[PDB]
Ligand binder design. Structure first.
Ligand SMILES: CC[C@H]1OC(=O)[C@H](C)[C@@H](O[C@H]2C[C@@](C)(OC)[C@@H](O)[C@H](C)O2)[C@H](C)[C@@H](O[C@@H]2O[C@H](C)C[C@H](N(C)C)[C@H]2O)[C@](C)(O)C[C@@H](C)C(=O)[C@H](C)[C@@H](O)[C@]1(C)O
Lengths: 23, 146, 214, 176, 37
RNA sequence: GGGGAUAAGCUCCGUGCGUCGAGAGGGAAACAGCCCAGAUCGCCGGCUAAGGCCCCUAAGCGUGUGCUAAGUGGAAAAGGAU
RNA sequence: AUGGUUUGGCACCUCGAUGUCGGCUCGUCGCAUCCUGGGGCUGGAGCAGGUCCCAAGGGUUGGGCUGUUCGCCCAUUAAAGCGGCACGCGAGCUGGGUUUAGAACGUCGUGAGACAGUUCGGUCUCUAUCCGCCGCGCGCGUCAGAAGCUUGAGGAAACCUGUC
RNA sequence: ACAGGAUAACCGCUGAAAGCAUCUAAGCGGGAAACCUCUUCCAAGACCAGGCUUCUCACCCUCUAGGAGGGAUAAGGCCCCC
């Protein structure tokens, strides 16, 4: 559970512009 | 071709920074700049040219906020369950020079050269240092205005 | 303070109390000890006294070692050890050249005797760390004594430094605590320490007043 | 604030010495020392009183004002009048007798308990089941009076133990 | 001392305060005394 | 939008939508599919994009006015709260 | 809403092989605490409890039945904790179970045969290269070459407890 | 083990913001097998490679005389031997 939430969170980074592959 | 330091081109000088009442982060970045020789215009990444930096009054150094009791300095011995931590307040009481050293050590390059730079940093807890024969030049932390 | 004197283990024996109870004592020769040097705070950084013990032919002693004895003004001794005290108020009790004897102790005073254990050589895990074994029947294939599993698998995937396995054992310094001294023999300079002190018959030991009961 | 906006009256027999943010008061009962916070400036009116002032109106100055003023009045009152805390003990076979500067309590324990008086505090026993503790520092007087109060666990059923005179302790009934 | 995510002034004498960043409720009746945690 | 529990890095569809597939270089610490941008070769020249400018780490412990006391920043819900 | 240990959903790594249940030996970690330690509130008189908060240093038994995990039972005990580590651990051990070929019963099938039905029997291979770990040496360094005796930054071990 | 230090839960003292009240914002205290010392052991390859002492503390050759190379030694050590 811990691993999944962290990956979806790091899509919010400034350089990703709110989208990332594999969500 | 751009100029690169030869055999005997490098030169050293000794700086002493009064760590009293200086912020730990601010003092460390100033020392880490000196030790790497960033101030000289003869800088070259693969050749060290930093100037020996002596830090005196290393136990009076001021740490802001609640970091005196809530910031831990961790260390692991390798054995299972071997992780032992000391809050900064305790680490200052036992041996105070460590807090200044680590906060500088983690500012320098981590490669083999950064291990050689460390040999040029002498830090003392008291207000006196034995290196008076080398005539350290007193150094202060200002900021060039733009 | 922490009285101490360098001694030699002689052997074990058996003596009887006034209440007719039997006590198994170890005979320790606490031979005369010569104070060769005193370590002070301003000189060395700790407060300790350096004793010497044993008789050695002066031809045998090596020249660097011989000079240390001559400078202190004493005859060379086989073993030189050092007792660590804890203050300058205790160092003042000692002076170079003063001789210590078995009389410093009294009957009924708890002491801690330190020595090098007996040698046991390459010892298996059934002997070293007191493992169990595996059954000698019901099918055990050639595993009657070997340890067994070492760790997990693939997590951690290493052996976790600190695990207990085979290797050399014994022959290491060890200290026994709160050993009563049954009798202080005056003529022969021998302590009758009730209990079993570590070492091998004729091995050097250090007997000091107990930390806990002292 | 309202507390901080009230000048501190100094009776004629009391001496007040001010050194910036450091304050010391000398009087008949003894000498006390105090230090005030950075935001507040402490000065002396020529009438012979104490006045405290706060420069701005944020939390720090407003909160520190009331404290800093009422800290001095306790300081001045300690060196003219002093503080005496009166206690009394309830229970059967509960005794108090004074030994030197120390105080002993017989609270029903298998052993008797002894309390040592620190510097600046004195114990004066009046009756076996009633005594008093007197000193200069209001905090130190109240502090030791707290420790004495913790000697016996609260007893809602019979009320055995130490008490303050005006204290009213809740009591329930142990029936079944 | 009840420890709940929700603390309320059960009775009229109950007072809601804050000590060391944690909300409490202090009342003369010890039953009402609770703390947010 | 359907199926699912309006779950899945699920599955099935539409899109003169994109990229990877078949794509190097800069950014996201590392990280095919996200953001900037399509590599003809050389240069010890210059200006920029996304992203940054205390030290590692290149360039700001930048200027003005405020806010935060929680290391919030540097994970989260019903709800509680002078 | 947390957790990811249960029954599942998906089919993304491995079918030119990732050995699968129990037991043994060996551990190590979390705290959502069984005992021991500290507290609040009690419809807490005392003894004994109930509930909640802090706390992971140590400890946590021997047997009957079953392949059993689990469970019931017999004696104690201060307690007989819950879970992760490929439902830890088979290049460490057993093979009782399951899941090859033999055989029989019940049931299905006209028949070869079949049964997450039952019963008896049924090969557990390998000289450790590298990381790892337990031990022991050879070389060099510490600004001349050697010998004693040491401070110790940094680690490791231990920490249980009852009755009178 | 005994003892000491800083603490968790919890109990407090002095106290304003907020004429009262509040363990809290400034201060001061108590407080557990947990943490740091205390007990035992390893430990200067701790590259900041440590300290107190003691002994030897001096002889030749070569290239070219700058440094290096070669030999014989002292204190000491090792090998062979019991
Ligand atoms: C005596 C000498 C034999 O040792 C055995 O009997 C071991 C004990 C078998 O285990 C027997 C015994 C047993 C119980 O397994 C231990 C049983 O499971 C099966 C029948 O294998 C082996 C290793 C089998 O492997 C196993 O094959 C399985 C299909 C997969 C399994 N694992 C990788 C997935 C793997 O170990 C396999 C295929 O025969 C290996 C092949 C190459 C051989 O024929 C080799 C040359 C054999 O002559 C032999 C090794 O010399």
């Amino acid at each position: 559970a811990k691993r999944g939430r962290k990956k979806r969170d790091r899509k919010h980074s400034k350089a990703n512009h709110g989208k990332r592959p594999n969500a | 071709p751009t100029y690169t330091p030869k055999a005997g081109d490098t030169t050293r000088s000794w700086y002493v920074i009064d760590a009293s009442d200086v912020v730990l982060g601010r003092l460390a970045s100033a020392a880490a700049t000196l030790l790497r020789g960033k101030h000289k215009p003869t800088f070259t990444p693969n050749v060290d040219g930093g100037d020996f930096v002596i830090v005196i009054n290393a136990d009076k150094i001021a740490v802001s906020g609640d970091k005196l009791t809530k910031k831990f300095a961790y260390r692991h011995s390798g054995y299972p369950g071997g992780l032992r931590k000391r809050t900064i307040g305790e680490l200052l009481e036992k041996h105070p020079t460590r807090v200044v050293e680590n906060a500088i050590i983690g500012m320098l390059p981590h490669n083999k050269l950064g291990r050689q730079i460390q040999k040029k940093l002498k830090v003392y807890a008291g207000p006196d240092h034995p290196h008076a024969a080398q005539q350290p030049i007193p150094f202060e932390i200002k900021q060039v205005a733009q | 303070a922490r009285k101490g004197i360098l001694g030699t283990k002689l052997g074990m024996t058996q003596v009887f109390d006034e209440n007719n109870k039997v006590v198994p004592v170890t005979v320790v020769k606490a031979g005369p000890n010569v104070v060769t040097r005193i370590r002070t705070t301003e000189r060395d950084g700790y407060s300790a006294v350096q004793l010497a013990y044993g008789e050695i032919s002066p031809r045998k002693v090596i020249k660097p070692v011989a000079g240390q004895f001559a400078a202190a003004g004493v005859n060379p001794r086989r073993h030189v050890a050092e007792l660590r005290l804890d203050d300058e108020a205790a160092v003042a009790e000692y002076e170079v050249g003063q001789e210590l004897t078995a009389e410093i102790f009294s009957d009924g005073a708890y002491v801690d005797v330190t020595g090098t254990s007996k040698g046991k050589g390459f010892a298996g895990t059934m002997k070293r760390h007191g493992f169990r074994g595996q059954g000698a029947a019901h099918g055990a294939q050639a595993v009657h004594r070997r340890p067994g599993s070492i760790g997990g698998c693939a997590t951690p995937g290493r052996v976790f430094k600190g695990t207990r396995m085979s290797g050399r054992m014994g022959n290491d310094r060890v200290t026994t605590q709160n050993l009563k001294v049954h009798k202080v023999d005056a003529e022969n300079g021998v302590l009758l320490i009730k209990g079993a002190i570590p070492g091998r018959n004729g091995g050097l030991v250090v007997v000091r007043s107990a930390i806990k009961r002292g | 604030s309202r507390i901080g906006k009230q000048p501190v009256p100094v009776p004629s027999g009391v001496d007040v010495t001010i050194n910036g943010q450091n304050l010391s008061v000398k009087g008949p009962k003894g000498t006390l020392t105090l230090d005030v916070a950075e935001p507040i400036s402490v000065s002396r009116a020529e009438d012979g009183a104490i006045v405290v002032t706060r420069p701005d109106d944020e939390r720090r100055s407003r909160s520190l004002h009331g404290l800093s003023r009422t800290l001095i009045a306790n300081l001045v009152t300690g060196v003219t009048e002093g503080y005496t805390q009166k206690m009394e003990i309830f229970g059967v076979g509960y005794r108090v007798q004074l030994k030197g500067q120390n105080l002993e309590f017989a609270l029903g324990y298998s052993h008797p308990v002894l309390i040592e008086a620190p510097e600046g505090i004195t114990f004066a026993v009046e009756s076996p089941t009633k005594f008093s503790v007197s000193g200069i520092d209001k905090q130190k007087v109240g502090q030791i009076s707290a420790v004495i109060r913790r000697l016996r666990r609260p007893d809602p059923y019979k009320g055995k133990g130490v008490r303050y005179e005006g204290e009213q302790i809740r009591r329930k009934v142990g029936k079944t | 001392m009840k420890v709940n995510p929700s603390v309320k002034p059960i009775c009229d004498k109950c007072r809601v305060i804050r000590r060391h960043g944690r909300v409490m409720v202090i009342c003369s009746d010890p039953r009402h005394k609770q703390r947010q945690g």
